[PDB]
């Protein structure tokens, strides 16, 4: 249905027999002349062992306000600025997931460290009662 | 379905640990009856 | 690492405050810097105030070729009315339906998951309080032993 | 399944497994004892002969190997189950032998409870009584202790005895039963001893270096007698897990020693089950009934 | 990587908390006996 590269809907559908993963024509083109496999998995793939679909062909409804000024004017702008601010937003979500990592590896080495010493302090008084 | 596997994985050591423990005992269960008897019949002959 | 959660009902504060201490004492084109200059930046780029207003006698003749190509888009949307319009309509419902036969299928396997883990927890902890009773019983009758070792061999 | 056995012309009063579990053992009033395979279909081959009055306790050893068996005839008789044929003839008792035990693991030896008034200890090489404690009454039960250096016995007087053998004189007395002493069996433990009695109540004591002084642990309900009296018979687990209990209600009552609950009490039965087995290695239990008949039950 | 770090985290501390029962009636016992 959807594309694994671009995060998007295609009307260009092309899926392979190396990685079958639907992904947009366009990125899979793209990457696979990059570097000769597969981007989600990374079985070897050269550009002719994929398969195209053929497509239903979706369409969505030209909107009543559809022209030169509407579609040049308005409508790039929300596009082009919603990509930046997403994107954007995108990284920073990476920044958060960095900082909660390395507040988890902190958490991890308490608890193994609390662990290792009182799985002993336990079993020292266990072993002071069966003197 | 990993956290209960990384549980899962060291599930025998949350068993096999106390199971250690329990026959330590009745090993020493071993020890206390070995003597116990040794100590009834201590006290017999020197009641006689 | 040993962590049993399903048996234990139950402390949080005295647990992580130790560990709070144990804490203390531990690719794109160019376009990735024009896009960093222009999100930055922020301003949106002068957009396409040409055809709008009105050199100024080709921008009115082109808003006449325009609205015709207008009312030419609007012939090809009146063409269906709602016809097309329920064509994207029954269509997207039959498109929505499967992630939630998805979400079906991933709450029945953690909810299985979890079924498997209460009776497991079930054996587990009862061998375990059976070997801490067995320990309580054998402690506590092996100091009777060394009570009977005592008086026995005082005599 | 079901596998109810059956060939026996009267009652069966005793029954037990090979100390492997291979081959079994009942027997009852015919004067005869008959053996079995236990798996299978249940085949039943081989009839030991001779025994004058009723079979009143048979008993194996422990590994397997040798056969004792207590007749109401005034005698106890030793059997090679290689053969099926007497080894012995353990007389000298004046009166109804009812019940017998080999030691287990130790040397040659059987104690023996009777009908005379006496209990008496007898050796397999010498035919010779070893001792005799004449308390003042009838023997119904004998068994062991695991050191074999003391001797267990239920009779008449309720009051549950047990003798030094090297000091010869009465060195465990417990009481609390109701009524009168029927059956006693040595959990392989070693240590706790279990006993029924009509009284409807089933008691435990554990016979050590130090008990408490008063040692009735755990107490089970349900047993049954009537205007019959017949003998009854009891068993722990192999694991000293599930109390196995007959009863003239035709109930066969099963419960464990932990929380003490019915497991079960089970019907099918006819006859008043006047022995229960456990077997050795299986969940398997075969229930000796006054029906003339035997049932084999998987649990 | 963060969920189960914080399930590794919280079922870790509980170790703890039933660690710290054990310990602090075993000392006690220690006294008591």
Same mark, same amino acid.
């Given at each position: ?5 671009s ?20 990125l ?8 000769? !496999?597969? =981007?989600?998995?990374?079985? =070897? ?12 062909? =979706? ?7 559809? !022209? ?9 702008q ?10 954007? !937003? ?5 920044? !958060? ?6 507040h ?7 608890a ?5 010493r ?14 | ?48 | ?9 139950g ?61 030419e ?24 339906e ?32 059976e070997?801490?009773?067995?320990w ?9 032993i ?10 | 399944?079901?596998?109810l056995?059956?060939g ?9 497994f090979?100390?492997?579990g291979?081959?079994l ?27 004058s ?5 048979l008993?194996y050893?422990?590994?397997?190997? $040798?056969?004792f #068996? ?26 109804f032998?009812?019940?017998c035990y ?22 397999i ?12 009454? +009838? ?10 250096? +003391? ?15 090297? +000091? ?5 007395? $417990? ?12 959990? #392989? ?7 029924n009695? $009509? ?21 089970? +309900? ?78 | ?5 914080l ?22 016992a220690?006294?008591?006996?």
């Amino acid at each position: 249905l959807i594309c694994s590269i671009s995060n998007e809907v295609p009307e260009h559908p092309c899926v392979s027999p190396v990685s079958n993963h639907v992904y947009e024509r366009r990125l899979i083109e793209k990457y696979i002349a990059e570097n000769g !496999t597969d =981007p989600i998995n990374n079985q =070897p793939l050269s550009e002719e062992q994929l398969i195209d679909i053929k497509v239903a062909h =979706p369409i969505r409804p030209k909107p009543p306000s559809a !022209t030169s000024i509407p579609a040049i004017l308005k409508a790039l702008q929300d596009e082009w600025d919603a990509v930046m601010l997403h994107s954007f !937003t995108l990284r920073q979500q990476l920044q !958060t997931t960095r900082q909660e990592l390395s507040h988890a590896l902190y958490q991890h080495d308490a608890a193994c460290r609390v662990i290792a010493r009182l799985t002993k302090e336990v079993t020292a008084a266990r072993e002071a009662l069966a003197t | 379905e990993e956290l209960k596997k990384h549980e899962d994985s060291a599930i025998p050591r949350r068993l096999e640990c106390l199971k250690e423990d329990v026959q330590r005992q009745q090993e020493r269960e071993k020890e206390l009856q070995h003597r116990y008897a040794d100590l009834l019949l201590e006290k017999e002959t020197l009641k006689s | 690492v040993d962590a049993l959660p399903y048996f234990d009902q139950g402390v949080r504060e005295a647990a992580a405050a130790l560990v709070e201490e144990e804490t203390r004492r531990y690719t794109d084109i160019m376009r990735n810097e024009f896009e960093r200059l222009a999100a930055r930046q922020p301003i949106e780029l002068l957009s396409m105030k040409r055809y709008e207003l009105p050199e100024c006698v080709n921008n009115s003749m082109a808003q006449l070729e325009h609205q015709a190509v207008r009312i030419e888009n609007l012939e090809l949307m009146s063409q269906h009315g709602c016809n097309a319009w329920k064509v994207y309509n029954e269509n997207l419902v039959h498109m929505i339906e499967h992630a939630q036969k998805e979400l079906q299928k991933l709450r029945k396997h953690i909810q299985d998951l979890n079924w498997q883990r209460k009776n497991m927890q079930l054996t587990a902890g009862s061998k375990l309080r059976e070997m801490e009773s067995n320990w309580v019983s054998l402690v506590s009758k092996n100091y009777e032993i060394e009570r009977t070792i005592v008086q026995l061999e005082n005599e | 399944p079901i596998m109810l056995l059956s060939g026996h012309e009267g009652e069966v009063y005793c029954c037990k497994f090979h100390p492997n579990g291979s081959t079994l053992a009942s027997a009852g009033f015919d004067r005869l004892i008959l053996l079995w395979n236990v798996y299978g279909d249940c085949d039943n081959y081989a009839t030991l002969k001779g025994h004058s009055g009723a079979v009143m306790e048979l008993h194996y050893n422990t590994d397997g190997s $040798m056969l004792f #068996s207590a007749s109401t005839d005034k005698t106890v008789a030793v059997w090679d189950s290689e053969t099926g044929e007497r080894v012995k003839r353990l007389k000298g008792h004046t009166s109804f032998v009812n019940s017998c035990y080999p030691a287990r693991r130790g040397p040659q030896l059987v104690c023996t409870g009777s009908d005379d008034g006496t209990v008496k200890l007898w050796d397999i090489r010498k035919k010779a009584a070893i001792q005799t404690f004449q308390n003042t009454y +009838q023997v119904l039960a004998v068994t062991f202790n695991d050191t074999s250096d +003391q001797i267990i016995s239920g009779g008449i007087d309720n009051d549950i005895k047990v003798w030094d053998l090297r +000091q010869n004189k009465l060195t465990y007395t $417990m009481r609390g039963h109701a009524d009168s002493v029927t059956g006693l069996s040595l959990s #392989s433990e070693g240590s706790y001893l279990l006993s029924n009695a $009509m009284d409807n109540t089933v008691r435990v004591w554990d016979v050590r270096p130090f008990a408490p002084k008063e040692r009735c642990v755990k107490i089970f +309900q349900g047993n049954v007698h009537n205007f019959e009296k017949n003998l009854l018979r009891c068993s722990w687990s192999p694991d000293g897990s599930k109390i196995a209990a007959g009863s003239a209600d035709r109930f066969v009552y099963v419960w464990d020693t932990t929380s003490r609950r019915i497991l079960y009490k089970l019907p099918g039965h006819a006859g008043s089950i006047n022995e229960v087995a456990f077997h050795p290695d299986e969940p398997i239990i075969i229930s000796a009934s006054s029906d003339k008949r035997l049932y084999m039950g998987e649990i | 990587e963060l969920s189960h770090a914080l399930y590794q985290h919280d079922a870790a501390c509980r170790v703890i908390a039933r660690l710290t029962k054990e310990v602090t009636a075993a000392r006690e016992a220690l006294a008591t006996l």
